[PDB]
Amino acid sequence: KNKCVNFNFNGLKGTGVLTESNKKFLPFQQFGRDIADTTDAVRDPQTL
Amino acid sequence: QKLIANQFNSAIGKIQDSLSSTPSALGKLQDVVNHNAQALNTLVKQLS
Numbered sequence: 001k002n003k004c005v006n007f008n009f010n011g012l013k014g015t016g017v018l019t020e021s022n023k024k025f026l027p028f029q030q031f032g033r034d035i036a037d038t039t040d041a042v043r044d045p046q047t048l
Numbered sequence: 049q050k051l052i053a054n055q056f057n058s059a060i061g062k063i064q065d066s067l068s069s070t071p072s073a074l075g076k077l078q079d080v081v082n083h084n085a086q087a088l089n090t091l092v093k094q095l096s
């Protein structure tokens with residue numbers, strides 16, 4: 001965390017910094033998006 | 049002189065209320081700001 005790296009979560013590949021998010025992902029929600037249809041927050045595999 | 053001074057003071061007093069009461073007196077500058085915001089937001093949304 002806190003250092004921008006390459007991330008590959010379940011086939012979703014990108015670059016950036018990952019931080020502990022304060023979003024309230026409802027239990028049926030996996031990943032979030034922003035106004036331009038790009039991934040903003042993501043849920044981890046293994047530990048949730 | 050006194051009457052002219054009183055008239056000028058009354059007009060300058062009323063001008064602030066005239067600006068404050070009407071919420072569409074400053075429409076040109078707001079239009080400029082809104083146009084820039086709309087153009088940028090549309091350019092962002094075209095990425096989807």
Ligand SMILES: *[C@@H]1O[C@H](CO)[C@@H](O)[C@H](O)[C@H]1NC(C)=O
Nearest residue numbers: 010030043044045046047048
């Ligand atoms: C393996 O993944 C599961 C979720 O599918 C998780 O519950 C479990 O804790 C993981 N194992 C370890 C050792 O973290």
